[PDB]
From TrEMBL, chain A:
Keyword tags: Coiled coil, Ion transport, Membrane, Transmembrane, Transmembrane helix, Transport
Coiled coil, from the record: 94-121
Pfam families: V_ATPase_I, V_ATPase_I_N, V_ATPase_prox
Family that this chain belongs to: Belongs to the V-ATPase 116 kDa subunit family.
Any GO CC annotation of this UniProt entry: vacuolar proton-transporting V-type ATPase complex
Domain of life: Bacteria
UniProt-recorded name of the protein: Archaeal/vacuolar-type H+-ATPase subunit I
From TrEMBL, chain C:
Coiled-coil segments on the chain, per record: 3-48
Keyword presence, Coiled coil: yes
Domain of life, source organism: Bacteria
Keyword Coiled coil applies: yes
Keywords from the UniProt entry: Coiled coil
Protein name (Swiss-Prot/TrEMBL): V-type ATPase subunit
Organism: Thermus thermophilus (strain ATCC BAA-163 / DSM 7039 / HB27)
């Protein structure tokens, strides 16, 4: 029976216990810090740990050069000595080749720039680079520059000089021949003009010109063939040993985590620490612990198991998200009913988009693993696109059929030839439908706000959640009078007054020295309304722009527009596509009002648990 | 579990250690008898020369 | 969880060490005493 010591926080002592019991563990006992301070690494342990990181480093280093870094779940179990022996030739070979290839490219670059200048300059000073008699100065001239230079030399150096030049492929590299001790006269003339000397880097420059010129030529010629050799070798190493580097990194990495864990236990700073024994079979288990709703619901199960407050776990969040999210596509012939294509790319596999090839092998813009993690989301994106197609047929209930409006059941050009959602009232009712869902979400949050202090036993939050619902009576009163118009207005001026007292009554037990901030709490209500409203109005608006896009915008609206309208269609389409991507951000902006500004949820100025954005990202 | 079991794993290494330190406690008595022995082999032998000499002297005189 | 596991485990490992020391010391002593007691007899024999 293998012994384990496990540690974690005090808050989740119970939750840890419970995960463990289900997993299979027996003999659980709590430990005090004296018992934890006994497991301090030793010089032999620490020496292996520095070394294990050294393997980890060497692996990243070499693998990055051969291709791309990634780490597979599998390890390859070996001793240290074995690890050190496998990496050392593989690293040596990669290290040599990447320097050799870089050296060749730099080398080739110099040879390419300067073969013709040095060749021209060498010929010019043939035998003149080692005769004591004469001194030569090489320098670069451009065509425009040459007359000035020539005059300038001639005043400096009289008529006891030879200036000859040959043309490389621009201007000329020019060479002046002067007597030794009239060297200074010639250099002064160039310096004064602003003409710099021509030479090569390092040793090659120092060597006579001819030697340099012949070599340079030969290196321009030779380098691509040497570069081809080194590249082949580098590829053959990459095909065979990319996989091995990845597996050595994985074994070392686990081992690093293991040893670091132990040193971290040793200081005994952990709150809750447990002792237990597991059987051999048990030892693997102990350490571990309809498609539209159930599939994302399955991932919410890991967060069901973990509560950190007296508020109920963030499981309801996903069905609250769904109506508004689905309801973001409600366009016509030109948007919603064509959206089908867009869904099929992500949940299926096409070649149409470049980084998407076989989605079945998880190939995306995103990393291959990451794409596998958001398969669940891809399915929900598909359901989103499909629910968007249906709300296209919803849309054509009020924009087509002769049973609902006078608009043709089949137009003579293309479906959705007329728009009847251009009448203010028809459009308004769908807006007012969304607004209602926002009132509900305000209620959902405010029950959740209050619940936190109920099961966490914190009075301040409790008082805030109950008192705020007083405000809700007053929101619903005022609303009835605006939604039905002549419904209240005298039955919510009198009643409003007893509704306002409920608003603050227990808020004053809580104290609250942000009395003005209640304008912003009403504002938060107004933000859920204004976001559902935009999702409705902006939804219909996208479609009404298709009125002069896919129907009719040319001639008299005769039959020929069918094959003329596409002129406009191609332009609008993409513009529309771009702006409706902005409309799908309205959901997560909706969650952030409530989630991130405290109404029963963790978030508000940091705090434990992770943002709902990172949670829904996979779901 | 292990508890007193783990302390009987110590009580085993420190009997390993105790056999080594009973292997000094054997070596001391061994080097002490192997020593003593040569000192009475020496005492016997010295007296013998000095007793062979005592009789030869008393012979030559007699 | 009971504190008796971790506590009484320290004090049974600690107790083990104590008995290792005790019989290391009272044994080293003994060995010297034997050597001595022999070497007194090695004089008592020699004189005879």
């Amino acid at each position: 029976m293998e012994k384990l010591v496990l540690a974690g926080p005090k808050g989740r002592a119970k939750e840890l216990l419970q995960s463990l019991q289900q997993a299979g563990v027996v003999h659980l006992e709590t430990l005090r810090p004296e018992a934890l301070s006994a497991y301090q690494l030793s010089p032999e342990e620490r020496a292996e740990l520095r070394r294990w990181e050294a393997v980890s480093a060497g692996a990243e280093h070499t693998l990055s050069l051969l291709g791309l870094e990634a780490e597979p779940a599998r390890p390859f179990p070996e001793g240290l000595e074995a690890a050190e022996k496998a990496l050392s030739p593989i690293q040596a070979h990669a290290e040599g080749l990447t320097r050799q290839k870089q050296e060749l490219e730099e080398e080739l670059a110099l040879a390419q720039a300067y073969l013709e200048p040095l060749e021209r300059l060498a010929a010019l000073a043939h035998g003149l680079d080692k005769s004591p008699f004469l001194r030569v100065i090489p320098f670069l001239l451009t065509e425009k520059e040459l007359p000035l230079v020539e005059e300038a030399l001639r005043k400096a150096l009289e008529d006891r000089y030879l200036l000859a030049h040959e043309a490389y492929a621009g201007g000329v590299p020019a060479l002046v021949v002067v007597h030794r001790k009239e060297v200074d006269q010639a250099k002064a003339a160039l310096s004064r003009a602003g003409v710099a000397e021509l030479r090569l880097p390092g040793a090659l420059g120092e060597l006579p010109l001819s030697e340099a010129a012949r070599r340079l030529k030969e290196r321009a010629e030779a380098a691509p063939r040497e570069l081809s050799e080194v590249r082949q070798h580098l590829a053959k190493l990459a095909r065979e040993s990319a996989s091995t580097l990845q597996s050595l990194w994985t074994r070392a990495q686990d081992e690093v985590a293991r040893l670091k864990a132990l040193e971290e236990l040793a200081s005994g700073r952990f709150g809750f620490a447990l002792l237990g024994y597991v059987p051999v079979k048990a030892k693997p288990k102990v350490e571990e612990a309809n498609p539209p709703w159930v599939k994302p619901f399955e991932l919410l199960v890991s967060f069901l198991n973990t509560p950190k407050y007296g508020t109920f776990d963030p499981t309801p969040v996903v069905p609250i998200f769904f109506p508004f999210w689905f309801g973001m596509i409600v366009g016509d012939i030109g948007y919603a009913l064509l959206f089908y294509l867009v869904g099929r790319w992500l949940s299926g596999y096409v070649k149409r988009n470049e980084p998407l090839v076989i989605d079945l092998f998880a190939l995306k813009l995103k990393p291959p693993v990451l794409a596998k993690l958001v398969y669940i989301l891809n399915w929900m994106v598909f359901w989103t696109v499909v629910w968007g197609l249906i709300y296209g047929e919803f849309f054509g209930t009020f924009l087509e059929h002769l049973g609902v409006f006078g608009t043709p059941e089949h137009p003579g050009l293309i479906p959705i030839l007329i728009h009847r959602i251009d009448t203010a009232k028809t459009a308004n009712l769908l807006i007012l439908l969304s607004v209602a869902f926002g009132v509900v979400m305000v209620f959902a949050g405010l029950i959740l706000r209050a619940y936190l202090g109920l099961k966490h036993r914190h009075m301040a939050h409790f008082w805030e959640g109950v008192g705020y619902l007083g405000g809700l009576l007053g929101i619903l009163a005022l609303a009835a009078s605006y939604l039905g118009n002549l419904q209240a207005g005298w039955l919510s001026a009198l009643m409003y007054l007893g509704f306002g007292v409920f608003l603050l009554s227990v808020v004053m037990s809580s104290i609250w020295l942000m009395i003005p901030e209640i304008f912003t709490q009403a504002g938060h209500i107004l933000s859920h309304i204004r976001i559902y409203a935009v999702g409705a109005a902006g939804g219909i608006l996208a479609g009404l722009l298709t009125d002069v896009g896919f129907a009719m915008a040319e001639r008299l609206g005769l039959i020929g527009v069918l094959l003329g309208i596409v002129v406009a269609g191609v332009l609008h389409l993409l513009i529309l596509l771009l702006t409706t991507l902005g409309h799908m951000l309205q959901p997560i902006r909706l969650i952030w009002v409530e989630f991130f500004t405290k109404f029963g949820f963790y978030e508000e100025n940091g705090r434990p648990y992770r943002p709902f954005k990172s949670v829904r990202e996979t779901q | 579990k292990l508890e007193a079991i783990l302390s009987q794993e110590v009580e085993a290494e420190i009997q390993a250690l105790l056999q080594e330190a009973e292997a000094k406690a054997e070596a001391v008595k061994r080097e002490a008898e192997e020593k003593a022995k040569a000192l009475l082999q020496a005492r016997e032998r010295a007296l013998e020369a000095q007793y062979r000499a005592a009789l030869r002297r008393a012979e030559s005189a007699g | 969880g009971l504190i008796k596991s971790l506590a009484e485990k320290e004090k049974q490992l600690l107790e083990r060490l104590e008995a290792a020391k005790k019989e290391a010391e009272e044994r080293v002593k003994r060995a010297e005493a034997e050597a001595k007691a022999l070497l007194e007899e090695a004089e008592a024999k020699a004189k005879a």
